[PDB]
Design an enzyme around this catalytic site. Structure first.
Site, PDB file in Angstrom:
ATOM      1  CD  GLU B  59      -2.426   1.466   2.601  1.00 58.06           C
ATOM      2  OE1 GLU B  59      -1.615   1.684   3.523  1.00 58.06           O
ATOM      3  OE2 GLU B  59      -3.664   1.475   2.763  1.00 58.06           O
ATOM      4  CG  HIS B  60       3.700   2.737   3.130  1.00 56.22           C
ATOM      5  ND1 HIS B  60       4.357   3.850   3.606  1.00 56.22           N
ATOM      6  CD2 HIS B  60       2.837   2.365   4.104  1.00 56.22           C
ATOM      7  CE1 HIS B  60       3.915   4.136   4.816  1.00 56.22           C
ATOM      8  NE2 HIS B  60       2.990   3.251   5.141  1.00 56.22           N
ATOM      9  CD  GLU B 136       2.998   6.132   8.452  1.00 61.40           C
ATOM     10  OE1 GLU B 136       2.193   6.796   9.136  1.00 61.40           O
ATOM     11  OE2 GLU B 136       2.748   5.747   7.292  1.00 61.40           O
TER      12      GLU B 136
END
Ligand SMILES: CCCCCCCCCCCCCCCCCC(=O)OC[C@H](COP(=O)(O)OCCN)OC(=O)CCCCCCCCCCCCCCCCC
Lengths: 54, 445
Positions: B59-60, B136
């Site tokens: 997804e990143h 994150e």
């Protein structure tokens, strides 16, 4: 001699009878109460700790 | 135009399916905007311990670069037409949706096709992205609600893929090479397990032909033979306590097994959940809210915020509550919160059931407001239920719920069921697990 023993301990027969019932009840209960104790404490006996300092 | 009249007038959810398997589903309206996204069935559930964290990494790197659009050029196309491109990856689903005008539909679908398919996955960008995820991870560590919910999942579905966090342990993310991600893409980003959704000023015929002319290259096979199957996940009632007295406030989440996406028992339970309600210190209802727990908390200033959840997966869920409160309240809410649940398990008045039904109807009708929530609903429903549940069906299922149904379903899911407590912060006062399990049953009943 047996008669005099009865005279000193008239409850002899009933004493032994209640002792028999007592033995059977404890043989039935003590394992079960011990099982309950293990049941309740098994949260703590299997408790696994961990240390995560920064 | 009464409520019922409006419900049977909501546009339909036309659903199609190309030959490869990609299900196209649209929902026309009159707005000049649109929301088109692809909902894949990837997630942390479909991840082994060796490659846990692959989905987050993919997804990143999705928006970073493509074979056709080398990189920032993709961002330039997205921004030039004013579209907002977003992506959310969960423990079960992963989705990309573009929020753009109706006129930019042909371009937006093309952009989504490029991301889900011709993703570059350059090693240099992988190395750049490796640090970002690590940062994150610390940010999420600061997010105490999120870490509490991850503790919930870890301690509830222990030894199962569900216990794995979405981001992954901060050891897998440091070794995930290009090879691991490529298998994830080629093994989970498949056409049958994909839903091309759109809502707003979208034409179903237009969406179908755009899909036919773009996503046709999508494959439905599974390489040599490897077909990642669905692994049922066990729910092991347990507890975890990460006591950190430095934290100002204590978070405790307790949940029992709730149903899956099937099992219509969700509709009664949600009503039951709505009866418990939700509270925050900045509400303003005060000691007048209909919810007994909310009124007690406001009266005694017990907690800062308690919220009831019904997280639901394909075959099992975590149904329960999560509250944030100071050190000398954790036990007290454990008394009241449990005391609330059993009330619904033993005596639920029809009045509060009607109140819960109304709250649920309001929640459903409000949550489907706006193109993006509608697109999310379509993409999620087609993966979970296999069809978008029309609001009229929701209304009927809510109407069939009454006091007896709520009592039965709560006693079936709540009464005498081992919970899955998870606590963080100064949680010393948190009752011992034996105390919680004892509170799960009432000696009057
Ligand atoms: C608390 C209650 C007791 C909890 C458990 C601990 C005591 C041991 C229990 C297990 C062993 C005895 C089990 C038993 O009942 O054995 C049978 C015996 C009477 O046998 P028998 O005379 O044949 O009569 C049978 C027909 N009724 O009966 C007995 O042997 C009775 C046990 C011996 C007597 C002492 C019992 C404990 C002390 C008294 C507790 C109750 C106090 C009540 C106070 C007054 C209330 C008005």
């Amino acid at each position: 001699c047996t008669f005099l023993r009865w005279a000193s301990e008239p409850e002899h027969d009933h004493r032994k009878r209640m002792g028999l019932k007592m033995l059977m009840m404890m043989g039935l209960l003590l394992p079960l109460v011990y099982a309950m104790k293990r049941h309740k404490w098994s949260v703590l006996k299997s408790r696994k700790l961990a240390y995560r300092p920064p | 135009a009464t409520y019922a009249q409006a419900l049977q007038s909501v546009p339909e959810t036309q659903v199609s399916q190309l030959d490869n398997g990609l299900r196209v589903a649209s929902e026309q309206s009159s707005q000049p905007t649109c929301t088109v996204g692809v909902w894949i069935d990837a997630g942390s559930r479909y991840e082994n311990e060796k490659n846990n964290g692959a989905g987050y990494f993919v997804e990143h790197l999705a928006f970073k670069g493509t074979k056709n659009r080398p990189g920032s050029a993709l961002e330039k196309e997205v921004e030039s037409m004013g579209a907002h491109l977003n992506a959310y990856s969960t423990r079960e689903h992963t989705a990309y949706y573009i929020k753009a005008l109706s006129k930019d539909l042909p371009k937006a679908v093309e952009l989504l096709a490029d991301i889900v398919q011709n993703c570059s996955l350059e090693d240099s960008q992988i190395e750049k992205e490796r640090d970002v995820i690590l940062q994150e991870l610390q940010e999420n560590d600061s997010s105490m609600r999120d870490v509490v919910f991850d503790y919930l999942h870890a301690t509830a579905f222990q030894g199962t893929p569900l216990a794995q966090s979405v981001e992954g342990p901060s050891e897998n993310v440091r070794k995930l090479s290009r090879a691991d991600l490529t298998e994830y893409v080629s093994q989970h980003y498949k056409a049958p397990r994909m839903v091309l959704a759109a809502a707003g000023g979208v034409e179903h015929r237009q969406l179908l032909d755009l899909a036919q002319k773009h996503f046709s290259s999508l494959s439905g096979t599974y390489v040599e033979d490897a077909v990642p199957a669905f692994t049922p996940c066990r729910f092991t009632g347990s507890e975890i306590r990460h006591r950190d007295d430095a934290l100002p406030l204590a978070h405790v989440a307790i949940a029992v097994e709730g149903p899956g996406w099937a099992n219509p028992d969700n509709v009664p339970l949600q009503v039951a959940n709505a009866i418990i309600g939700h509270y925050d210190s900045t509400y303003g209802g005060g000691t007048h809210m209909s919810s007994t727990l909310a009124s007690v908390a406001a009266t005694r200033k017990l907690c800062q915020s308690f919220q009831t959840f019904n997280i639901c997966y394909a075959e099992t869920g975590l149904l329960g509550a999560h509250f944030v409160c100071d050190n000398m309240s954790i036990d007290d809410m454990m008394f009241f919160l449990q005391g609330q649940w059993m009330r619904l398990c033993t005596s639920a008045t029809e009045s509060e059931v009607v109140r819960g039904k109304n709250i649920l109807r309001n929640a459903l009708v409000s949550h489907l407001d706006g193109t993006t929530p509608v697109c999310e609903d379509i993409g999620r429903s087609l993966l979970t239920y296999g069809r978008r549940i029309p609001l009229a069906e929701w209304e009927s299922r809510i109407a069939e719920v009454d006091a007896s149904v709520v009592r039965e379903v709560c006693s079936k899911y709540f009464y005498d069921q081992c919970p899955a407590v998870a606590g963080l912060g100064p949680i010393e006062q948190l009752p011992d697990y034996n105390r919680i399990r004892s509170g799960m049953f009432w000696l009057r009943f």
